[PDB]
Ligand SMILES: NC(=O)c1ccc[n+]([C@@H]2O[C@H](COP(=O)([O-])OP(=O)(O)OC[C@H]3O[C@@H](n4cnc5c(N)ncnc54)[C@H](OP(=O)(O)O)[C@@H]3O)[C@@H](O)[C@H]2O)c1
């Protein structure tokens with residue numbers, strides 16, 4: 001309530017959260033602060049015209065923030081903790097959402113400033129911007145049960161939220177993390193298809209979106225099972241069972257696994273890459 005928030009990073013995810021946060025009417029635009037290394041017109045400017053405090057000093061951020069968000073590239077993270085760790089007061093919580101980066105790696109490096117640093121690993125996705133972002137997190141060792149709450153509450157406002165035992169976050173990323181992208185991609189395709197049948201762009205694209213959003217809800221709001229809802233919509237006639245057959249023909253599913261995997265495996269590597277060099 002008297003809580004302030006900051007993003008040492010910036011970019012999309014920052015702006016994204018920034019956005020869904022003020023959106024959630026949970027925080028005040030100006031009650032937010034993020035450091036602008038260089039400033040990426042789009043992102044930064046956006047936030048600026050958004051009403052959030054943007055400073056080139058990812059230090060003032062550190063002070064202004066009752067809760068800290070690490071919104072930088074994974075490889076950047078290091079060059080930060082040891083540039084701000086000296087400013088880590090016992091008040092704020094450090095929420096790192098940089099993918100791949102481990103809690104350990106941070107605690108056990110940020111301890112070299114504060115005896116017991118309070119930190120939690122985070123994982124979300126741009127859709128948070130509206131409020132559908134899918135989030136999951138893990139509590140550090142210096143995790144006092146009142147933070148896992150604030151967190152779970154804070155994020156669970158701009159989306160879905162749930163505790164997760166860190167050793168999952170990597171899989172989780174190649175899913176809820178990247179997933180959106182897969183969608184934006186599938187849609188762009190569908191749209192093309194609708195057009196390849198006459199439908200206009202602005203019309204088709206949008207019909208596809210509305211169909212995805214719809215399928216989403218149904219599956220969530222029921223147990224059923226995807227395969228269930230599958231049969232439940234393909235009349236022995238066709239047009240659908242037929243469209244399926246085609247997708248089915250070209251390993252459509254296979255391609256989705258492949259991507260979850262790719263994304264995951266990649267994340268494994270990114271982190272298991274800065275453990276040394
Ligand atoms: N703060 C918010 O604004 C907020 C927060 C949450 C959700 N939503 C909103 O979310 C709505 C969609 O609610 P939702 O679909 O986002 O929440 P959600 O994705 O349904 O939360 C996630 C998963 O928990 C599943 N689940 C049930 N038993 C489980 C178990 N034993 N282990 C693990 N997972 C289990 C649910 O699916 P199943 O029911 O098929 O079991 C669900 O897919 C939208 O209508 C949007 O308005 C908004």
Ligand SMILES: N[C@@H](CCC(=O)O)C(=O)O
Nearest residue numbers: 131156157159160161220
């Ligand atoms: N917290 C609720 C909100 C759902 C909604 O806003 O539709 C849930 O996750 O079900």
